[PDB]
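ERR on first pass: missing label on line 2. Operator R.T. fixed the label and resubmitted. Corrected input:
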Amino acid sequence: SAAQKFVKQVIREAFLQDASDIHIEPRQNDVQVRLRIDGALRPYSTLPKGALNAVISVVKIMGGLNIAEKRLPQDGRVRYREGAIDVDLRLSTLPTVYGEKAVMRLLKKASDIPEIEDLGFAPGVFERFKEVISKPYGIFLITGPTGSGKSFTTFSILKRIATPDKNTQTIEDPVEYEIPGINQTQVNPQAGLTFARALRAFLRQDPDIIMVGEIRDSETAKIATEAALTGHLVIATLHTNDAAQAITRLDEMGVEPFNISAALIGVLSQRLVRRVCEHCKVEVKPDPETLRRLGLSEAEIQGARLYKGMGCERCGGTGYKGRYAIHELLVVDDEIRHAIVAGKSATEIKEIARRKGMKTLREDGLYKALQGITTLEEVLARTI
Amino acid sequence: SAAQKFVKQVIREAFLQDASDIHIEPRQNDVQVRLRIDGALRPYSTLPKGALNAVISVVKIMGGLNIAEKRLPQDGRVRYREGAIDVDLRLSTLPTVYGEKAVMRLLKKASDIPEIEDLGFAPGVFERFKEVISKPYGIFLITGPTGSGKSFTTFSILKRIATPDKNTQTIEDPVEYEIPGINQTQVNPQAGLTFARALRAFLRQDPDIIMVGEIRDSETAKIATEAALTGHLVIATLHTNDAAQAITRLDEMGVEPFNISAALIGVLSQRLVRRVCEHCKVEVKPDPETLRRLGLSEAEIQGARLYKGMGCERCGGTGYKGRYAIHELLVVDDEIRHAIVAGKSATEIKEIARRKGMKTLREDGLYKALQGITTLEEVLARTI
Amino acid sequence: SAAQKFVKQVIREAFLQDASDIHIEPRQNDVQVRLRIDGALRPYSTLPKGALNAVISVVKIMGGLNIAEKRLPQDGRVRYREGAIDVDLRLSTLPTVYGEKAVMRLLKKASDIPEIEDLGFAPGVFERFKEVISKPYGIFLITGPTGSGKSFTTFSILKRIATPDKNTQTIEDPVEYEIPGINQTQVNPQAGLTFARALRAFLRQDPDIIMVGEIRDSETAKIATEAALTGHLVIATLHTNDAAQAITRLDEMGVEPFNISAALIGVLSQRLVRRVCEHCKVEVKPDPETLRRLGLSEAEIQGARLYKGMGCERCGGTGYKGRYAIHELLVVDDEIRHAIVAGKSATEIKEIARRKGMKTLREDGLYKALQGITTLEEVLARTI
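pass 2 clean. output:
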């Protein structure tokens, strides 16, 4: 009874709450049910400990798992739908000394991916961003922390450029999104489709745009670079604290600087900071020391403002609803390319880049705090 | 019975005075019982030879081990109590030509998990420990050999962050702490549920917090870090005698250096020394050879104070009263992150960190001796 | 499965437009088939998504792949020699969220068998080509994806050296490069005539020249090696992406390292770079660091004049007009044979040959970029 109601009730709300994840997680006497909302788990409900196993068996069914294989941890995919609700789930079940556990991660659709316009870049760098991502060929990187939008930006760009005339071709594991116009290839070690193999397949597929879900394999750093040189547009993902580091990372991973230089068109770093919920938005003031570090001066600081939430139903009482992306844009030109071929470091490139207009990740963040998206605190609190 | 009371009482003293282990050994009238309090097998008491069977039968009957079996070894788990103590032990016995031997290991209960404030950090390093482990995301490494205090540090941090409202998924083999609010997977080869398989599921299962009791499987090291890279807060336990080299060790475990860089919030190397009993502390010379080897300053020698234990009864007659943890904390800012992605060694990472003010394991320990808590020599014995 | 209707209409159009590739794109509700011409795609037709699965399934049959196997993707060459439409296709059923994408890359026809002077060899690789092919003993291996002219050149070797004084016999799958006056055999796996089996007979013929159309089978790697080992010129297509890697590749395929070195005399990799159409030969004088990092002799980096096609209504506006061959023949001597047994990296064994006069593909292609034939980017794209 309760077990069947339970699985579907949590899943239904997870989509409605836009939880990124659904948890059915057993404890000593009961099961704590939690939804990952705006990047963090919070309680939803509880199951009786007995209901737990009935519940886990039900989700194994929901994801297509082998219901009989209760010794080994398993996973699969739930095409969970309810009325207008439609988000695939990645279901994973696991034994616990407290009974079986199950979690259903929300996977996404083309309709969840923001337009390139919805990504959150400062307008200055955004127009330059669009100019870089619109290039007929060349390396464009999107790098950084969880939820940063490395994936969403990558796909916002890929969808934009996945026009009738372009083989937008990607590497995902499993496919994260359901998107038309783009060949969303899934990594499959049984087939030999490792990330490096999947990019070898990318070139064999005669592509227009590469998407490397994460450039982990050294070979993917090189293949993505080759792709750029071969006349493909290259979009690839890393985890860096800045754009100059991401270029540096292409060299740290073994990509020759003469290719990075010829191929590179721009590097983007990106991260998430909480967004103030509109239903409770209120004007507050910023910390002037941070603002002085931005170069704002007393002259502009005197009129500076930040926003926070007062709390509302939309934000779950936290004052914030969703998180927004912050962007660093290393638009690449001749001086940067001369620095790259020479083998220059992230610091050396960064100095050129800022002189050339590279609004920094931190700066775009603090800027968005100042433009009313967030607070000059959350920005600082989500980096290293 | 005398044996049952003996066992409950020795266990109480062992936990109360901080033994790592309880040693009950074969002797021809009488049985020698020692407690490894503060690392030394301090004498505790004795029993008639026939007590080897009565007392060990208690160790086994409680452990869940077969009493009659005296040829093959056994290893169990018991929640034991007397006086101020109610704490878990591992229970094991050894087949012996002279009659069995039994030793019980001082596991702590979930309810005994210390606040991070209770881990022995001086206020300075403490605030940094707190700031590191409380980072909204990333991996914290806890390192060292038998006698380092890893499980308390490991679980202390967990106590602070894995509230009942947060999803947590822990790997143990077998379970030591249990711990409502946190899902605890016990590794089970019957299934094929390795630490790696346990984490394979944890990753797909999206907990906020991941804990691994021992990073032994390569895949386990990688996954725990993978989550930590972008947003999960991860606690990992492993063997290393240097906070910066620990980074190198995680690289050795198969975790991509770039993954480590992004994930890592800090590394703590630990060691425990004997605390001097207050009621018989002896202010010492201090010894010039011991001091020379350690490098103590006249500022310390002529004003800070080192003590030895003389004997105060309350110390088991050995002059000491419990372990004093010594802590070497590497705080991972983004310069150290750079060093990591750059492939830098402990020397390079440590030198950057010391240039930033990082206190070494010997500097901390010696301070602790100089705080009048421990002995100059106890510190020396576990460092250079 | 029709599916196949489109597969056939598409293939016919792809050849007529000289598309480099066919893209049967699995989509959300349908399948979008696109052709690649001069750096961009154009749509041809669509199929129902259900037809996609039928496409994937039938193309698997076509490639000799298992139609019943869709737990994983498959790939292979399809002998679609449909009269006027007779370019061989590289089938890659790469799995996406919408099913596998049936890419079919176009592999070239005999295209007349050239003299070695018609291949565009630099004097370095040219004279060495002449030297290597003139031999009575040893394997002359050629690399790059079919369509890059491997077999074009492989058969050029025979055209030039299979004189009335020499016993020549070749085996292919299917015969791709016919040469009048030369005895050609086609494999027949149905009979059991693997390449190895044929080559085994070739050993038995005490031939002067033994051709292998594609050294792909493990048995064949061993026998093709024996083909030369036993005292015969062997000429072969080694279907990999690098001449130097081709050496190591025989070892990768299970060929005794020793037999491989005994068996080899020269390995050529070749590619074609897109041309700059004269009009837009803009002398983008090089950054010497690019050229130096490319391993271009200092003498050459100084004489170097890099180009970039402007794009340029006569290209256009890609910056390029058609393709131009570049070459790297690793003439083999004893330094190379040491390296062959060793299984050295492509770069090092190639560099050894480079100093023998083998303008590496990077030196040669770059030299051609440096003359305005092609551009930096194309060279890097083809030579990294």
